[PDB]
Each structure stands twice: as C-alpha cells, then as structure tokens.
C-alpha cells in the first residue's frame, strides 16, 4: 500500500471531552506554539508549561491532558529531545516535534 506509517500512543485521562479532538487540536493537550507568543521575555516556556495560566486554544480549562502538557509529565519524559528515550531507534517519532 505504500510507506509504513508509525503510530505513537499518548496516555490520556478517559474523562477528556471528545468534543476536543473534533477540531485541529494538540496531542500534548496545551497549545504551545511560538505563534501564540506575546513578545514577553520568556513567555513561551510559560505558554507551554505554566499551569496557573490557561490554554490559549481553550481558555476555560488549563490542559486537556495533564500527563502530556506538563513539564516532567509522562508525555514529556518520553518524547522530549532532552531525554531521548527514542533516541537510538531509527524509526521516526512523530511526537518528537511536539
């Protein structure tokens, strides 16, 4: 059929709304782009990882997934470039980008 895709799994709470994932949405749960920057000094580390604040894409709740969005969460420890648990395998990690 063609090139093999690679499907990477991320743990989520079972009580996340399935209205989230009907839209373009983040697999890490908290929208973290530098396009959402507010031209502060270190805004996008706190746009990504500060949880007193709220998600820019969903302003009313902070995260959609607490195991992924947070620093030192389970989503972070697997797929971050600093920790590189999937750093030896030549298979492409799709979530290495996120």
């Amino acid at each position: 059929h063609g090139q093999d895709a690679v499907c990477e799994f991320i743990a989520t709470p079972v009580a996340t709304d399935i209205n989230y994932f009907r839209r373009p949405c983040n697999p890490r749960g908290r929208a973290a782009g530098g396009v959402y920057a507010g031209d502060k000094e270190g805004d996008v580390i706190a746009l990504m990882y500060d949880h007193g604040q709220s998600d820019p894409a969903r302003p009313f709740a902070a995260t959609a997934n607490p195991w992924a969005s947070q620093r030192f969460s389970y989503g972070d420890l697997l797929y971050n470039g600093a920790y590189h648990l999937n750093g030896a395998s030549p298979v492409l990690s799709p979530c290495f980008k996120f």
Partner: protein
C-alpha cells in the same frame, strides 16, 4: 459555538464569581431608597412578632 467548531460550555459553576461576591447582601439602598411614598398597613399578620 465560538469562532470555530468549538462548542463552549457555560455551566452555572462558572457563575460562582458573579453571585458569591458580598454585594448580594447589600440592600441598604434598596430597602431605604424605596421606602419613600409610604403605603399604609394593610392589616399585617405574619409581619409582627
């Protein structure tokens, strides 16, 4: 709907900052300001102890 396919949810627990402020009990301008144009006693029963 907001500016998207986002469905948005009000859910009265959001209203906890509006009504639980302690101006709900502040009625001094209410009872005192309306207390002009006095209507006479229309035979009170449960208004007296």
């Amino acid at each position: 709907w907001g500016k998207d396919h986002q469905v948005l949810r009000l859910s009265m627990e959001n209203a906890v900052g509006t009504v639980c402020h302690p101006s709900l009990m502040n009625i001094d301008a209410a009872v005192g300001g309306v207390n002009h144009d006095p209507v006479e006693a229309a035979n009170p029963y449960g208004a007296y102890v």
